Amino acid sequence: XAXVXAXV
Amino acid sequence: XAXVXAXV
DNA sequence: GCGTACGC
DNA sequence: GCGTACGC
Ligand SMILES: *C(=O)c1cnc2ccccc2n1
Ligand SMILES: *C(=O)c1cnc2ccccc2n1
Ligand SMILES: *C(=O)c1cnc2ccccc2n1
Ligand SMILES: *C(=O)c1cnc2ccccc2n1
Ligand SMILES: [Cl-]
Ligand SMILES: [Cl-]
Fold this sequence. Notes:
Structural class of chain A: little secondary structure
Largest sheet of chain A: none
Entry title: Echinomycin-(gcgtacgc)2 complex
Number of strands of chain A: 0
PDB class: dna/antibiotic
Keywords: bisintercalator, hoogsteen basepair, depsipeptide, quinoxaline, thioacetal, antibiotic, antitumor, DNA-antibiotic complex
Radius of gyration of chain A: 4 Å
Oligomer: homodimer
Chains A, B: echinomycin
Bound molecules: 2-carboxyquinoxaline, chloride ion
Shape of chain A: flat
Assembly: tetrameric
């Protein structure tokens, strides 16, 4: 759920 | 040489 | 000449 | 519920 590299 | 995650 | 950045 | 960010 976090987006820092994927954001899902 | 670039530093964006290691910076060497 | 090597690896940092988060949870809906 | 998945992976982005650069070259001295
Ligand atoms: C987001 O909160 C989050 C948490 N755990 C995960 C596990 C696997 C894929 C994506 C995820 N996203
Ligand atoms: C993004 O691609 C990504 C990959 N691994 C991680 C680990 C810890 C925090 C954030 C991250 N983001
Ligand atoms: C920095 O310019 C740079 C370029 N290539 C590398 C290869 C392996 C380790 C570190 C490196 N740093
Ligand atoms: C830092 O840990 C890191 C790792 N892989 C990369 C690939 C492309 C650009 C920058 C990167 N930085
Ligand atoms: Cl949980
Ligand atoms: Cl070269």
